[PDB]
Amino acid sequence: EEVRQFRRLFAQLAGDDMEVSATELMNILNKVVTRHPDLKTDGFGIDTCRSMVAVMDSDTTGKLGFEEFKYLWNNIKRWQAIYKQFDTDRSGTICSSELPGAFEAAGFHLNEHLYNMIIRRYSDESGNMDFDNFISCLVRLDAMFRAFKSLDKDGTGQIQVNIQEWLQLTMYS
């Protein structure tokens, strides 16, 4: 009864409006990381969770319905496993050297330039990335892959994006 127990997880987490808000997501995540001492974090901030919710909120209800949440949560579960696997010095954080292997293992094969860009945006002055920043980066990276894929109808490797779609994809995220 796994999908049962997951259905229970969602229902109790979503509460009275049956959708998962930025705050409810923030709270469950902080609650869960608390039990994983191998994962260092300063915590999931509200801003970060609003951004994770918008980027998963396919129907734009402001909040995460069952499928949108299930997709997010199944990814976080695989990604968490990967972070542990690739923290091979047990700093509880992913440094620049560990990051490629980790992201590849989640199925994003980026080049050097991009790996650097990501380190610049999401890692600290030491080149170290803690767990909330890794999850947040990955959720967005995956959404941006998926959004490109949707727009490349013809499979040319190029998308045309109008300003309305651009603003929608960049501001609601």
- Give the residue numbers of the binding site for Ca(2+): 14, 17, 19, 24, 42, 57, 59, 61, 63, 68, 87, 89, 91, 93, 98, 130
Contact with Ca ion (CB under 5 A) among 22, 130, 138, 173: 130
Which two three-digit tokens encode residue 68? 């949108």
**49 contacts ligand 2UB (rule: CB under 6 A):** no
What does the per-residue mask of binding to ligand 2UB show for 7-36, with x meaning CB under 6 A?
-------------------------xx--x
> Cα angle vertex 49, ends 172, 70, to 5°?
90
What would the two tokens of residue 28 be?
A: 């469950």
Give 15's DSSP letter. G
Residues 6+ apart with CB under 8 A from 84: 38, 39
Report the length, in residues, of the chain.
173
Residue numbers at the binding site for a second copy (CB under 8 A): 21, 42, 45-48, 50-51, 54, 57, 60, 62, 110-111, 113-114, 116-118, 120-122, 125, 136-137, 140-141, 144-145, 148, 152, 157-164, 166-173
Q: Which of 42, 61, 74, 77 binds ligand 2UB (CB under 6 A)?
A: 77
Rg (CA), the chain: 17
- The HSE-up count of residue 165 (CA atoms within 13 Å, CB side) is 9
Site of interaction with ligand 2UB (CB under 6 A) = 32-33, 36, 76-77, 80
